[PDB]
Amino acid sequence: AFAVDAAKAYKDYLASGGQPITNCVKMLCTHTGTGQAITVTPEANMDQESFGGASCCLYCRCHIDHPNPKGFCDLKGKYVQIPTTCANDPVGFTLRNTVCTVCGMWKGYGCSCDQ
Amino acid sequence: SSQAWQPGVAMPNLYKMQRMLLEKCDLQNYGDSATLPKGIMMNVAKYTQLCQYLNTLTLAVPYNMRVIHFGAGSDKGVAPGTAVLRQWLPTGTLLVDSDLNDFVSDADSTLIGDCATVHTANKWDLIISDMYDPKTKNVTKENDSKEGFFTYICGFIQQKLALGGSVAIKITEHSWNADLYKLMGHFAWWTAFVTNVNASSSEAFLIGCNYLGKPREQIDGYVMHANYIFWRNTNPIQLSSYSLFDMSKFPLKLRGTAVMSLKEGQINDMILSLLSKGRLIIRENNRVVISSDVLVNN
Ligand SMILES: Nc1ncnc2c1ncn2[C@@H]1O[C@H](CSCC[C@H](N)C(=O)O)[C@@H](O)[C@H]1O
Ligand SMILES: [Mg+2]
Ligand SMILES: [Zn+2]
Ligand SMILES: [Zn+2]
């Protein structure tokens, strides 16, 4: 009936004023792509940057179990896009937001799915 | 003149034909650093300039390709060179990597330990290495030929590389071996290459193109390393970042080369002709399996 909860712990540490995690891996590209959230090769536009996937996942970097029936990871082996004004804390950005399941953009930073 | 707009510089043919004696290396700009774009690491820029130069040679590229990579971990716990190679190759290629201390990675599969404990059942189409031993720094006598991990690498090549494939392996002033220069004489062409972003160091990569399985030419290995030090001592090179700003033609091309199985005593002059021009591979085509040995004590 007992178990550890690391996702609540980084949030409390940040609100009190600690420094975020460093050494994530950034790539060279043209900046004329399509703008979707998770892809098989780099796809950033004129308002974003692109990064390697395993180095931005909280469970991979701390050495712990993935929270799943079949411990399956969504990022290892692909590439992820981040907006330029938020690029100082990539680990925290992915924990807090959600992806739209019909057009593929981030909810709140790209999905226009309502007339 | 036009050199500052290329990705690097290669060793000219008339320096390979002389007979010199060995001396000490003394570079005019020995301690200088270059100016990089706003958020980028030195190890991501170095691997991007090496793949731009390999695009100008006659490599073979089949359906369902196979690649392996030694010495891949950093002193901070991640793998930047493995992530540039996966951006370059065609979608669906299989890739495996390895090192002595622990790390985390984007490849299909990973193994941890000393290089002499690794074994495999099949054969491979391309091979890459960045290994280096720390106690080479502690210099106390004349400069002679070295052993260690260099003895494992010469034997893996003669036993598990397919007829028609290629390689690239790294060296410096004090880290080198005499029987590896002698084996460059069993390919169809060869050279040594220096990147424009680390031009104030004595590092280089040694490269062999399309493999044949027996000697074409005879080479003495002690004499050919002394010819390499004479070129660097009389020809200085100037640091530059220009080619990182244009990426519109980076990815490798899709030729669909053919694959067969054959037995010794069906190798014609016809057959050798096709291997040399970059258009045939010879091996088996079953399925892939690997492992590592463990010692038990106390
Ligand atoms: N005998 C040996 N067996 C296995 N790995 C070795 C070795 N001698 C040196 N190495 C490894 O060689 C590596 C070179 S260190 C730099 C490697 C570079 N960061 C890269 O991206 O590949 C070191 O991490 C060291 O652990
Ligand atoms: Mg340097
Ligand atoms: Zn993960
Ligand atoms: Zn939507």
Side-chain angles (χ1 to χ4, degrees), chain A residues 1-18 20-114, chain B residues 1-252 254-262 264-265 267-297:
Chain A
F2 161 88
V4 199
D5 182 317
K8 187 185 307 183
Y10 191 51
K11 292 177 204 201
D12 281 354
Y13 161 85
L14 279 177
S16 74
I21 290 155
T22 52
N23 283 289
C24 311
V25 179
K26 180 172 153 199
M27 322 298 301
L28 293 151
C29 61
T30 78
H31 289 247
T32 69
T34 79
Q36 297 187 272
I38 295 171
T39 51
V40 302
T41 190
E43 284 287 350
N45 75 34
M46 165 166 161
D47 291 327
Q48 314 161 317
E49 306 262 32
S50 301
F51 290 88
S55 63
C56 302
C57 173
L58 180 71
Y59 305 108
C60 287
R61 297 280 307 258
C62 281
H63 301 145
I64 69 174
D65 281 342
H66 276 78
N68 196 351
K70 306 313 185 183
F72 173 88
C73 183
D74 275 349
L75 296 162
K76 156 161 181 157
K78 301 193 183 72
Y79 301 90
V80 69
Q81 276 65 240
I82 308 282
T84 288
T85 57
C86 293
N88 59 314
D89 189 353
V91 165
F93 187 92
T94 61
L95 266 170
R96 287 182 197 180
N97 291 274
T98 310
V99 188
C100 175
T101 182
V102 189
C103 64
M105 306 295 194
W106 289 108
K107 253 183 92 183
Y109 303 82
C111 176
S112 79
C113 277
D114 282 334
Chain B
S1 182
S2 179
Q3 286 188 346
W5 284 274
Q6 306 279 147
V9 183
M11 176 181 189
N13 274 354
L14 189 68
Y15 285 102
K16 301 170 189 170
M17 295 175 82
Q18 306 292 307
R19 307 253 181 284
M20 315 289 292
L21 296 169
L22 178 67
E23 295 190 271
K24 274 151 164 162
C25 192
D26 181 345
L27 300 176
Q28 168 181 45
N29 57 353
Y30 182 49
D32 289 357
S33 284
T35 286
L36 309 158
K38 179 153 182 289
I40 308 281
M41 308 170 184
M42 172 67 54
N43 277 337
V44 159
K46 186 197 279 185
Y47 273 67
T48 291
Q49 278 183 335
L50 173 72
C51 295
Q52 283 171 335
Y53 176 73
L54 293 166
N55 275 336
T56 76
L57 313 173
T58 62
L59 311 179
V61 192
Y63 285 96
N64 288 290
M65 206 177 170
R66 309 156 169 188
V67 184
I68 185 170
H69 180 205
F70 291 93
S74 79
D75 75 351
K76 48 167 173 270
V78 299
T82 293
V84 175
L85 293 173
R86 196 155 177 101
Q87 180 192 359
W88 185 53
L89 300 150
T91 316
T93 301
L94 284 177
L95 171 75
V96 171
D97 67 3
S98 195
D99 198 301
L100 174 80
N101 309 296
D102 217 337
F103 70 101
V104 64
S105 174
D106 290 294
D108 299 289
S109 184
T110 298
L111 295 166
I112 305 284
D114 194 84
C115 70
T117 67
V118 170
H119 310 266
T120 79
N122 51 280
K123 291 185 175 185
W124 303 84
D125 299 318
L126 172 69
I127 302 178
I128 307 298
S129 165
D130 202 36
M131 301 196 267
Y132 182 104
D133 186 336
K135 295 156 200 93
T136 293
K137 282 279 175 212
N138 193 331
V139 177
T140 177
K141 181 56 179 76
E142 274 214 27
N143 190 8
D144 209 23
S145 177
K146 313 289 194 294
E147 284 182 295
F149 71 76
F150 281 115
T151 300
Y152 174 81
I153 284 286
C154 284
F156 190 92
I157 283 179
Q158 289 185 293
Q159 228 153 315
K160 300 292 187 186
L161 183 69
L163 293 182
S166 295
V167 313
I169 315 284
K170 180 183 96 187
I171 61 169
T172 75
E173 179 186 5
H174 291 90
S175 184
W176 66 282
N177 178 275
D179 266 320
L180 180 65
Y181 275 108
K182 189 186 179 191
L183 197 60
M184 296 289 115
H186 298 217
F187 296 80
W189 192 77
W190 83 276
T191 195
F193 181 74
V194 172
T195 73
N196 262 340
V197 78
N198 208 19
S200 60
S201 163
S202 76
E203 167 181 275
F205 292 90
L206 213 62
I207 291 170
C209 192
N210 302 304
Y211 180 56
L212 304 171
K214 65 187 176 46
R216 209 190 61 98
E217 152 184 8
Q218 298 274 341
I219 291 176
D220 177 328
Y222 295 88
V223 176
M224 183 82 64
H225 191 65
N227 287 342
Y228 166 75
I229 303 288
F230 183 69
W231 169 54
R232 300 291 320 264
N233 270 344
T234 56
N235 292 80
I237 299 161
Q238 157 172 346
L239 296 150
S240 174
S241 284
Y242 292 172
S243 79
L244 302 174
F245 282 84
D246 181 24
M247 295 290 292
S248 76
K249 303 208 219 151
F250 190 65
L252 172 72
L254 264 291
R255 308 168 157 137
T257 316
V259 169
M260 275 160 48
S261 291
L262 296 181
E264 291 190 355
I267 316 285
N268 311 339
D269 294 356
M270 202 192 186
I271 302 282
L272 281 309
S273 180
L274 270 67
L275 292 174
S276 285
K277 300 199 189 105
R279 43 186 49 231
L280 181 68
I281 290 274
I282 293 178
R283 64 162 160 79
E284 40 65 17
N285 206 22
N286 297 328
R287 98 220 196 202
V288 191
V289 185
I290 65 182
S291 80
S292 165
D293 289 333
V294 175
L295 179 61
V296 321
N297 56 30

